[PDB]
PDB file of N, CA and C in Angstrom:
ATOM      1  N   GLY E   1       0.702  -0.991   0.026  1.00  0.00           N
ATOM      2  CA  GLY E   1       0.041   0.336  -0.067  1.00  0.00           C
ATOM      3  C   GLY E   1       0.356   1.260  -0.427  1.00  0.00           C
ATOM      4  N   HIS E   2       0.612   2.093  -0.616  1.00  0.00           N
ATOM      5  CA  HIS E   2       1.197   3.812  -0.486  1.00  0.00           C
ATOM      6  C   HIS E   2       1.167   4.417   0.771  1.00  0.00           C
ATOM      7  N   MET E   3       1.440   3.852   1.598  1.00  0.00           N
ATOM      8  CA  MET E   3       2.056   4.802   2.950  1.00  0.00           C
ATOM      9  C   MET E   3       3.295   5.381   2.737  1.00  0.00           C
ATOM     10  N   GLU E   4       3.825   5.153   2.052  1.00  0.00           N
ATOM     11  CA  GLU E   4       5.046   5.960   1.719  1.00  0.00           C
ATOM     12  C   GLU E   4       3.860   7.632   0.395  1.00  0.00           C
ATOM     13  N   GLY E   5       4.865   8.400   0.551  1.00  0.00           N
ATOM     14  CA  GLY E   5       4.107   9.598  -0.223  1.00  0.00           C
ATOM     15  C   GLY E   5       3.610  10.584   1.120  1.00  0.00           C
ATOM     16  N   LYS E   6       2.502   9.399   1.916  1.00  0.00           N
ATOM     17  CA  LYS E   6       1.785  10.714   2.582  1.00  0.00           C
ATOM     18  C   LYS E   6       2.788  10.385   4.219  1.00  0.00           C
ATOM     19  N   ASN E   7       3.667   9.955   4.092  1.00  0.00           N
ATOM     20  CA  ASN E   7       4.448   9.411   5.488  1.00  0.00           C
ATOM     21  C   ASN E   7       5.359  11.020   5.549  1.00  0.00           C
ATOM     22  N   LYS E   8       4.217  12.151   4.889  1.00  0.00           N
ATOM     23  CA  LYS E   8       4.811  14.139   4.513  1.00  0.00           C
ATOM     24  C   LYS E   8       3.345  14.420   4.488  1.00  0.00           C
ATOM     25  N   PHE E   9       3.013  14.250   6.544  1.00  0.00           N
ATOM     26  CA  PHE E   9       2.592  15.645   6.568  1.00  0.00           C
ATOM     27  C   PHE E   9       2.225  16.799   7.627  1.00  0.00           C
ATOM     28  N   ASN E  10       1.772  17.399   6.300  1.00  0.00           N
ATOM     29  CA  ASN E  10       2.372  18.838   6.984  1.00  0.00           C
ATOM     30  C   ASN E  10       1.884  19.453   7.212  1.00  0.00           C
ATOM     31  N   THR E  11       1.678  21.366   7.507  1.00  0.00           N
ATOM     32  CA  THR E  11       1.560  22.053   7.929  1.00  0.00           C
ATOM     33  C   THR E  11       1.153  23.170   7.088  1.00  0.00           C
ATOM     34  N   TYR E  12      -0.398  23.207   7.076  1.00  0.00           N
ATOM     35  CA  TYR E  12      -1.623  24.237   7.164  1.00  0.00           C
ATOM     36  C   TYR E  12      -1.437  25.597   7.604  1.00  0.00           C
ATOM     37  N   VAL E  13      -2.232  26.003   7.387  1.00  0.00           N
ATOM     38  CA  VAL E  13      -2.799  27.557   8.447  1.00  0.00           C
ATOM     39  C   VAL E  13      -4.488  28.203   7.301  1.00  0.00           C
ATOM     40  N   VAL E  14      -4.391  27.927   7.713  1.00  0.00           N
ATOM     41  CA  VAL E  14      -6.336  28.636   7.142  1.00  0.00           C
ATOM     42  C   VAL E  14      -6.580  29.720   7.398  1.00  0.00           C
ATOM     43  N   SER E  15      -7.588  30.757   7.298  1.00  0.00           N
ATOM     44  CA  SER E  15      -7.365  32.360   7.566  1.00  0.00           C
ATOM     45  C   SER E  15      -8.212  32.479   6.420  1.00  0.00           C
ATOM     46  N   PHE E  16      -9.709  32.528   7.707  1.00  0.00           N
ATOM     47  CA  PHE E  16     -10.663  32.835   7.282  1.00  0.00           C
ATOM     48  C   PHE E  16     -11.337  34.042   7.112  1.00  0.00           C
ATOM     49  N   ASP E  17     -12.248  33.561   6.939  1.00  0.00           N
ATOM     50  CA  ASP E  17     -12.575  35.773   6.346  1.00  0.00           C
ATOM     51  C   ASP E  17     -14.363  35.760   6.591  1.00  0.00           C
ATOM     52  N   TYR E  18     -14.631  35.951   7.458  1.00  0.00           N
ATOM     53  CA  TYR E  18     -15.947  36.809   7.179  1.00  0.00           C
ATOM     54  C   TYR E  18     -16.540  37.311   8.680  1.00  0.00           C
ATOM     55  N   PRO E  19     -18.261  37.934   8.112  1.00  0.00           N
ATOM     56  CA  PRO E  19     -18.273  39.665   9.129  1.00  0.00           C
ATOM     57  C   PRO E  19     -18.619  38.866  10.610  1.00  0.00           C
ATOM     58  N   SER E  20     -18.046  39.547  11.802  1.00  0.00           N
ATOM     59  CA  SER E  20     -19.010  39.133  12.885  1.00  0.00           C
ATOM     60  C   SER E  20     -20.136  38.583  12.890  1.00  0.00           C
ATOM     61  N   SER E  21     -21.454  39.535  11.859  1.00  0.00           N
ATOM     62  CA  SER E  21     -22.153  38.522  12.250  1.00  0.00           C
ATOM     63  C   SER E  21     -22.909  37.327  12.522  1.00  0.00           C
ATOM     64  N   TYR E  22     -21.792  36.939  11.672  1.00  0.00           N
ATOM     65  CA  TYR E  22     -21.971  35.197  11.202  1.00  0.00           C
ATOM     66  C   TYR E  22     -20.645  34.204  12.363  1.00  0.00           C
ATOM     67  N   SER E  23     -21.311  34.418  13.578  1.00  0.00           N
ATOM     68  CA  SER E  23     -19.626  34.523  14.688  1.00  0.00           C
ATOM     69  C   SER E  23     -20.548  33.534  15.197  1.00  0.00           C
ATOM     70  N   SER E  24     -22.057  33.326  16.083  1.00  0.00           N
ATOM     71  CA  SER E  24     -22.671  32.610  15.700  1.00  0.00           C
ATOM     72  C   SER E  24     -22.900  31.011  15.208  1.00  0.00           C
ATOM     73  N   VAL E  25     -23.093  31.104  14.124  1.00  0.00           N
ATOM     74  CA  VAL E  25     -22.966  30.306  12.578  1.00  0.00           C
ATOM     75  C   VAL E  25     -21.690  29.584  13.415  1.00  0.00           C
ATOM     76  N   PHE E  26     -20.949  29.994  12.955  1.00  0.00           N
ATOM     77  CA  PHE E  26     -19.469  30.232  12.130  1.00  0.00           C
ATOM     78  C   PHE E  26     -18.942  28.528  13.728  1.00  0.00           C
ATOM     79  N   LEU E  27     -19.525  29.059  14.552  1.00  0.00           N
ATOM     80  CA  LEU E  27     -19.112  28.631  15.638  1.00  0.00           C
ATOM     81  C   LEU E  27     -19.248  26.867  15.609  1.00  0.00           C
ATOM     82  N   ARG E  28     -20.107  26.294  14.181  1.00  0.00           N
ATOM     83  CA  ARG E  28     -20.557  25.103  13.722  1.00  0.00           C
ATOM     84  C   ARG E  28     -19.517  24.674  12.597  1.00  0.00           C
ATOM     85  N   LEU E  29     -19.095  25.500  11.725  1.00  0.00           N
ATOM     86  CA  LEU E  29     -17.855  24.636  11.126  1.00  0.00           C
ATOM     87  C   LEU E  29     -16.443  24.707  12.183  1.00  0.00           C
ATOM     88  N   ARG E  30     -16.465  26.050  13.103  1.00  0.00           N
ATOM     89  CA  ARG E  30     -15.154  25.754  14.843  1.00  0.00           C
ATOM     90  C   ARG E  30     -15.036  24.386  14.588  1.00  0.00           C
ATOM     91  N   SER E  31     -15.690  23.323  15.118  1.00  0.00           N
ATOM     92  CA  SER E  31     -16.565  22.622  15.616  1.00  0.00           C
ATOM     93  C   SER E  31     -16.324  22.128  14.495  1.00  0.00           C
ATOM     94  N   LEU E  32     -16.182  21.747  13.486  1.00  0.00           N
ATOM     95  CA  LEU E  32     -16.227  20.805  12.421  1.00  0.00           C
ATOM     96  C   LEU E  32     -14.701  20.677  12.176  1.00  0.00           C
ATOM     97  N   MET E  33     -13.547  21.592  12.082  1.00  0.00           N
ATOM     98  CA  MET E  33     -12.648  21.764  11.956  1.00  0.00           C
ATOM     99  C   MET E  33     -12.071  21.154  13.303  1.00  0.00           C
ATOM    100  N   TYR E  34     -12.201  21.000  14.347  1.00  0.00           N
ATOM    101  CA  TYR E  34     -11.782  20.177  15.288  1.00  0.00           C
ATOM    102  C   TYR E  34     -11.845  18.885  15.251  1.00  0.00           C
ATOM    103  N   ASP E  35     -13.438  18.401  14.791  1.00  0.00           N
ATOM    104  CA  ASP E  35     -13.760  17.481  14.562  1.00  0.00           C
ATOM    105  C   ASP E  35     -13.041  17.012  13.443  1.00  0.00           C
ATOM    106  N   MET E  36     -12.209  17.384  12.994  1.00  0.00           N
ATOM    107  CA  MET E  36     -11.348  17.641  11.940  1.00  0.00           C
ATOM    108  C   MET E  36      -9.711  17.215  11.898  1.00  0.00           C
ATOM    109  N   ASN E  37      -9.367  17.564  11.160  1.00  0.00           N
ATOM    110  CA  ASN E  37      -7.394  17.451  11.356  1.00  0.00           C
ATOM    111  C   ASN E  37      -6.913  19.165  12.420  1.00  0.00           C
ATOM    112  N   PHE E  38      -8.217  19.928  12.181  1.00  0.00           N
ATOM    113  CA  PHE E  38      -7.460  21.355  12.063  1.00  0.00           C
ATOM    114  C   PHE E  38      -7.122  21.265  13.951  1.00  0.00           C
ATOM    115  N   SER E  39      -7.037  22.602  13.989  1.00  0.00           N
ATOM    116  CA  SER E  39      -5.908  22.473  16.094  1.00  0.00           C
ATOM    117  C   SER E  39      -5.908  24.153  15.209  1.00  0.00           C
ATOM    118  N   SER E  40      -5.908  24.309  17.292  1.00  0.00           N
ATOM    119  CA  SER E  40      -5.571  26.296  17.928  1.00  0.00           C
ATOM    120  C   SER E  40      -4.850  26.448  17.261  1.00  0.00           C
ATOM    121  N   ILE E  41      -3.827  25.830  17.576  1.00  0.00           N
ATOM    122  CA  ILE E  41      -2.421  25.802  18.584  1.00  0.00           C
ATOM    123  C   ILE E  41      -1.140  25.532  17.549  1.00  0.00           C
ATOM    124  N   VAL E  42      -0.887  26.307  16.402  1.00  0.00           N
ATOM    125  CA  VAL E  42       0.715  25.709  15.848  1.00  0.00           C
ATOM    126  C   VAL E  42       2.440  26.174  16.767  1.00  0.00           C
ATOM    127  N   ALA E  43       3.739  25.885  16.462  1.00  0.00           N
ATOM    128  CA  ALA E  43       4.168  26.232  16.496  1.00  0.00           C
ATOM    129  C   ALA E  43       4.889  27.627  15.033  1.00  0.00           C
ATOM    130  N   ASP E  44       5.433  28.471  15.713  1.00  0.00           N
ATOM    131  CA  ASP E  44       5.422  29.119  14.691  1.00  0.00           C
ATOM    132  C   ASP E  44       7.158  28.718  14.401  1.00  0.00           C
ATOM    133  N   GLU E  45       7.905  29.953  13.840  1.00  0.00           N
ATOM    134  CA  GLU E  45       9.221  29.546  13.136  1.00  0.00           C
ATOM    135  C   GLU E  45       9.698  29.737  13.832  1.00  0.00           C
ATOM    136  N   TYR E  46      10.487  30.065  14.487  1.00  0.00           N
ATOM    137  CA  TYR E  46      10.838  30.978  16.259  1.00  0.00           C
ATOM    138  C   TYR E  46      10.820  29.317  16.617  1.00  0.00           C
ATOM    139  N   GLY E  47       9.520  28.736  16.692  1.00  0.00           N
ATOM    140  CA  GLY E  47       9.411  27.416  17.895  1.00  0.00           C
ATOM    141  C   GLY E  47       8.592  27.524  18.740  1.00  0.00           C
ATOM    142  N   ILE E  48       7.558  29.089  18.709  1.00  0.00           N
ATOM    143  CA  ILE E  48       6.405  29.458  19.966  1.00  0.00           C
ATOM    144  C   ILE E  48       4.567  29.266  20.069  1.00  0.00           C
ATOM    145  N   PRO E  49       4.127  27.937  20.645  1.00  0.00           N
ATOM    146  CA  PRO E  49       2.879  27.568  20.171  1.00  0.00           C
ATOM    147  C   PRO E  49       1.949  28.992  19.650  1.00  0.00           C
ATOM    148  N   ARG E  50       1.629  28.743  18.628  1.00  0.00           N
ATOM    149  CA  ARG E  50       0.158  29.929  18.527  1.00  0.00           C
ATOM    150  C   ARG E  50      -0.321  29.718  18.814  1.00  0.00           C
ATOM    151  N   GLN E  51      -1.764  30.186  19.214  1.00  0.00           N
ATOM    152  CA  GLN E  51      -2.606  30.090  19.327  1.00  0.00           C
ATOM    153  C   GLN E  51      -2.793  30.083  18.309  1.00  0.00           C
ATOM    154  N   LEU E  52      -3.992  30.141  17.329  1.00  0.00           N
ATOM    155  CA  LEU E  52      -4.436  30.801  15.698  1.00  0.00           C
ATOM    156  C   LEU E  52      -5.872  31.088  15.924  1.00  0.00           C
ATOM    157  N   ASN E  53      -6.296  30.996  17.494  1.00  0.00           N
ATOM    158  CA  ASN E  53      -8.104  30.952  17.498  1.00  0.00           C
ATOM    159  C   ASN E  53      -8.103  32.451  17.826  1.00  0.00           C
ATOM    160  N   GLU E  54      -8.105  33.283  16.272  1.00  0.00           N
ATOM    161  CA  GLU E  54      -7.902  34.936  16.046  1.00  0.00           C
ATOM    162  C   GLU E  54      -9.611  34.067  14.900  1.00  0.00           C
ATOM    163  N   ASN E  55      -8.959  34.214  13.629  1.00  0.00           N
ATOM    164  CA  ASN E  55      -9.142  34.244  12.482  1.00  0.00           C
ATOM    165  C   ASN E  55      -8.266  33.383  11.688  1.00  0.00           C
ATOM    166  N   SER E  56      -6.937  32.612  12.388  1.00  0.00           N
ATOM    167  CA  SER E  56      -7.194  31.837  11.645  1.00  0.00           C
ATOM    168  C   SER E  56      -6.665  30.639  12.335  1.00  0.00           C
ATOM    169  N   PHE E  57      -6.012  28.786  11.400  1.00  0.00           N
ATOM    170  CA  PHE E  57      -6.673  27.779  11.909  1.00  0.00           C
ATOM    171  C   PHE E  57      -5.379  27.178  11.572  1.00  0.00           C
ATOM    172  N   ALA E  58      -5.063  26.039  12.015  1.00  0.00           N
ATOM    173  CA  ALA E  58      -4.010  24.989  11.758  1.00  0.00           C
ATOM    174  C   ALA E  58      -4.670  24.086  10.988  1.00  0.00           C
ATOM    175  N   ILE E  59      -3.054  22.657  10.040  1.00  0.00           N
ATOM    176  CA  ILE E  59      -4.154  21.426  10.208  1.00  0.00           C
ATOM    177  C   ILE E  59      -2.055  20.907   9.869  1.00  0.00           C
ATOM    178  N   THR E  60      -2.092  19.912  10.222  1.00  0.00           N
ATOM    179  CA  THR E  60      -1.641  18.906   9.525  1.00  0.00           C
ATOM    180  C   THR E  60      -1.636  18.021   8.648  1.00  0.00           C
ATOM    181  N   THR E  61      -1.920  18.363   7.421  1.00  0.00           N
ATOM    182  CA  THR E  61      -2.853  17.940   6.231  1.00  0.00           C
ATOM    183  C   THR E  61      -1.263  17.970   5.740  1.00  0.00           C
ATOM    184  N   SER E  62      -2.113  17.140   4.353  1.00  0.00           N
ATOM    185  CA  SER E  62      -0.403  17.146   3.216  1.00  0.00           C
ATOM    186  C   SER E  62      -1.474  17.386   1.887  1.00  0.00           C
ATOM    187  N   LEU E  63      -2.477  17.073   2.025  1.00  0.00           N
ATOM    188  CA  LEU E  63      -3.196  17.504   0.776  1.00  0.00           C
ATOM    189  C   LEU E  63      -3.064  18.760   0.101  1.00  0.00           C
ATOM    190  N   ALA E  64      -4.046  20.107  -0.524  1.00  0.00           N
ATOM    191  CA  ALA E  64      -3.404  20.455  -1.452  1.00  0.00           C
ATOM    192  C   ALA E  64      -4.389  21.858  -0.470  1.00  0.00           C
ATOM    193  N   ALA E  65      -4.731  22.908  -0.964  1.00  0.00           N
ATOM    194  CA  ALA E  65      -4.692  23.789  -0.391  1.00  0.00           C
ATOM    195  C   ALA E  65      -5.872  24.047  -1.266  1.00  0.00           C
ATOM    196  N   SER E  66      -6.253  23.738  -2.689  1.00  0.00           N
ATOM    197  CA  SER E  66      -8.402  23.652  -2.996  1.00  0.00           C
ATOM    198  C   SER E  66      -8.732  22.382  -2.117  1.00  0.00           C
ATOM    199  N   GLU E  67      -8.483  21.373  -1.702  1.00  0.00           N
ATOM    200  CA  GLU E  67      -9.085  20.625  -1.540  1.00  0.00           C
ATOM    201  C   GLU E  67      -8.979  20.560  -0.473  1.00  0.00           C
ATOM    202  N   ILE E  68      -8.129  21.286   0.771  1.00  0.00           N
ATOM    203  CA  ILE E  68      -8.653  21.180   2.041  1.00  0.00           C
ATOM    204  C   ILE E  68      -9.968  22.298   2.410  1.00  0.00           C
ATOM    205  N   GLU E  69     -10.172  23.459   1.268  1.00  0.00           N
ATOM    206  CA  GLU E  69     -11.007  23.664   0.869  1.00  0.00           C
ATOM    207  C   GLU E  69     -12.129  23.524   0.822  1.00  0.00           C
ATOM    208  N   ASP E  70     -12.530  21.680  -0.023  1.00  0.00           N
ATOM    209  CA  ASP E  70     -13.621  20.953  -0.225  1.00  0.00           C
ATOM    210  C   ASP E  70     -13.914  20.687   0.685  1.00  0.00           C
ATOM    211  N   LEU E  71     -13.396  20.533   1.129  1.00  0.00           N
ATOM    212  CA  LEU E  71     -13.110  19.581   3.202  1.00  0.00           C
ATOM    213  C   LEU E  71     -13.404  20.303   3.666  1.00  0.00           C
ATOM    214  N   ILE E  72     -13.918  21.648   3.994  1.00  0.00           N
ATOM    215  CA  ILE E  72     -13.811  22.763   4.245  1.00  0.00           C
ATOM    216  C   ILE E  72     -15.572  22.926   3.846  1.00  0.00           C
ATOM    217  N   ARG E  73     -15.960  23.758   3.222  1.00  0.00           N
ATOM    218  CA  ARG E  73     -16.925  23.627   2.596  1.00  0.00           C
ATOM    219  C   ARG E  73     -18.138  22.440   1.694  1.00  0.00           C
ATOM    220  N   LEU E  74     -17.687  21.734   2.567  1.00  0.00           N
ATOM    221  CA  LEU E  74     -18.814  20.889   2.361  1.00  0.00           C
ATOM    222  C   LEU E  74     -19.035  20.244   3.215  1.00  0.00           C
ATOM    223  N   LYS E  75     -18.276  21.045   5.041  1.00  0.00           N
ATOM    224  CA  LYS E  75     -19.182  20.905   5.486  1.00  0.00           C
ATOM    225  C   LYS E  75     -19.385  22.040   5.899  1.00  0.00           C
ATOM    226  N   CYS E  76     -19.772  22.608   4.275  1.00  0.00           N
ATOM    227  CA  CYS E  76     -21.140  23.454   5.636  1.00  0.00           C
ATOM    228  C   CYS E  76     -22.200  23.943   5.144  1.00  0.00           C
ATOM    229  N   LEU E  77     -22.419  22.391   5.111  1.00  0.00           N
ATOM    230  CA  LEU E  77     -23.808  21.311   4.202  1.00  0.00           C
ATOM    231  C   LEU E  77     -24.644  21.372   6.338  1.00  0.00           C
ATOM    232  N   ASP E  78     -23.117  21.279   7.151  1.00  0.00           N
ATOM    233  CA  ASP E  78     -24.067  21.216   8.191  1.00  0.00           C
ATOM    234  C   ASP E  78     -24.223  22.359   8.725  1.00  0.00           C
ATOM    235  N   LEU E  79     -23.864  23.452   8.887  1.00  0.00           N
ATOM    236  CA  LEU E  79     -23.859  24.858   9.608  1.00  0.00           C
ATOM    237  C   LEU E  79     -25.143  25.337   8.499  1.00  0.00           C
ATOM    238  N   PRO E  80     -26.308  25.669   8.957  1.00  0.00           N
ATOM    239  CA  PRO E  80     -27.044  26.579   8.519  1.00  0.00           C
ATOM    240  C   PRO E  80     -26.248  27.806   6.585  1.00  0.00           C
ATOM    241  N   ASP E  81     -26.396  28.497   7.151  1.00  0.00           N
ATOM    242  CA  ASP E  81     -25.374  29.679   6.007  1.00  0.00           C
ATOM    243  C   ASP E  81     -24.347  30.470   6.891  1.00  0.00           C
ATOM    244  N   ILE E  82     -23.316  30.165   6.122  1.00  0.00           N
ATOM    245  CA  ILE E  82     -22.136  31.901   6.120  1.00  0.00           C
ATOM    246  C   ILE E  82     -21.316  32.039   5.225  1.00  0.00           C
ATOM    247  N   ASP E  83     -22.095  33.160   4.313  1.00  0.00           N
ATOM    248  CA  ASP E  83     -20.454  33.804   3.452  1.00  0.00           C
ATOM    249  C   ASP E  83     -19.206  34.171   3.565  1.00  0.00           C
ATOM    250  N   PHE E  84     -18.490  32.771   3.676  1.00  0.00           N
ATOM    251  CA  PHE E  84     -17.097  32.614   4.369  1.00  0.00           C
ATOM    252  C   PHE E  84     -16.177  32.463   2.807  1.00  0.00           C
ATOM    253  N   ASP E  85     -15.175  32.916   3.337  1.00  0.00           N
ATOM    254  CA  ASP E  85     -14.178  33.183   2.341  1.00  0.00           C
ATOM    255  C   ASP E  85     -13.229  33.249   3.024  1.00  0.00           C
ATOM    256  N   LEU E  86     -12.741  31.846   2.136  1.00  0.00           N
ATOM    257  CA  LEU E  86     -10.749  31.272   3.097  1.00  0.00           C
ATOM    258  C   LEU E  86      -9.455  31.824   2.309  1.00  0.00           C
ATOM    259  N   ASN E  87      -8.497  31.098   2.874  1.00  0.00           N
ATOM    260  CA  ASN E  87      -7.343  31.173   2.740  1.00  0.00           C
ATOM    261  C   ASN E  87      -6.098  30.339   2.373  1.00  0.00           C
ATOM    262  N   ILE E  88      -5.868  29.257   1.950  1.00  0.00           N
ATOM    263  CA  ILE E  88      -4.819  28.053   2.382  1.00  0.00           C
ATOM    264  C   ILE E  88      -3.022  28.635   2.242  1.00  0.00           C
ATOM    265  N   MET E  89      -3.450  28.784   3.359  1.00  0.00           N
ATOM    266  CA  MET E  89      -1.478  28.880   2.545  1.00  0.00           C
ATOM    267  C   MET E  89      -0.967  27.405   4.216  1.00  0.00           C
ATOM    268  N   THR E  90       0.352  28.080   3.876  1.00  0.00           N
ATOM    269  CA  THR E  90       0.915  26.818   4.116  1.00  0.00           C
ATOM    270  C   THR E  90       1.700  28.304   6.096  1.00  0.00           C
ATOM    271  N   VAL E  91       1.702  27.290   6.926  1.00  0.00           N
ATOM    272  CA  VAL E  91       2.160  27.646   8.472  1.00  0.00           C
ATOM    273  C   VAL E  91       3.413  28.697   8.162  1.00  0.00           C
ATOM    274  N   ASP E  92       3.727  28.121   8.188  1.00  0.00           N
ATOM    275  CA  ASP E  92       6.133  29.776   7.634  1.00  0.00           C
ATOM    276  C   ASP E  92       5.004  30.546   6.185  1.00  0.00           C
ATOM    277  N   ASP E  93       3.843  30.466   5.902  1.00  0.00           N
ATOM    278  CA  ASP E  93       3.436  31.632   5.417  1.00  0.00           C
ATOM    279  C   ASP E  93       2.204  33.016   5.643  1.00  0.00           C
ATOM    280  N   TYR E  94       2.265  32.049   7.024  1.00  0.00           N
ATOM    281  CA  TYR E  94       1.662  32.396   7.499  1.00  0.00           C
ATOM    282  C   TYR E  94       2.125  33.390   9.011  1.00  0.00           C
ATOM    283  N   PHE E  95       3.349  33.155   9.390  1.00  0.00           N
ATOM    284  CA  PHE E  95       4.085  33.560  10.816  1.00  0.00           C
ATOM    285  C   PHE E  95       4.751  34.563   9.097  1.00  0.00           C
ATOM    286  N   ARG E  96       4.300  34.499   8.697  1.00  0.00           N
ATOM    287  CA  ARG E  96       5.963  35.778   8.077  1.00  0.00           C
ATOM    288  C   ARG E  96       4.612  36.994   7.695  1.00  0.00           C
ATOM    289  N   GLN E  97       3.888  37.449   7.994  1.00  0.00           N
ATOM    290  CA  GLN E  97       2.949  38.026   7.556  1.00  0.00           C
ATOM    291  C   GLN E  97       3.087  38.597   9.333  1.00  0.00           C
ATOM    292  N   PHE E  98       2.879  37.626  10.512  1.00  0.00           N
ATOM    293  CA  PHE E  98       2.318  37.655  11.981  1.00  0.00           C
ATOM    294  C   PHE E  98       3.518  37.869  12.728  1.00  0.00           C
ATOM    295  N   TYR E  99       4.510  38.901  13.067  1.00  0.00           N
ATOM    296  CA  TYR E  99       5.488  38.114  13.281  1.00  0.00           C
ATOM    297  C   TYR E  99       5.078  38.133  15.158  1.00  0.00           C
ATOM    298  N   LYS E 100       6.668  37.995  15.892  1.00  0.00           N
ATOM    299  CA  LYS E 100       7.041  37.784  17.140  1.00  0.00           C
ATOM    300  C   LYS E 100       5.546  38.226  18.243  1.00  0.00           C
TER     301      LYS E 100
END
């Protein structure tokens, strides 16, 4: 079996965009994140376990960015409705914007 290849679990960050009026709605989607492989903490480039629970989140997946998107957006069928827009990026790409 192809255990190889996907022996490299990467680390991504997802930046969700949505107005605060949908926070009550989004609480469903957030619960989906942690039900999935997403996390609230990830180490930065220095090595500090950062909290993401502002706006972005992280995941140890190795699928592609638009694959993470599809994963999340198909979980939107659980929640009522929220116009959210997410940007997947790698964790490194994330912390390079938000510093110490």
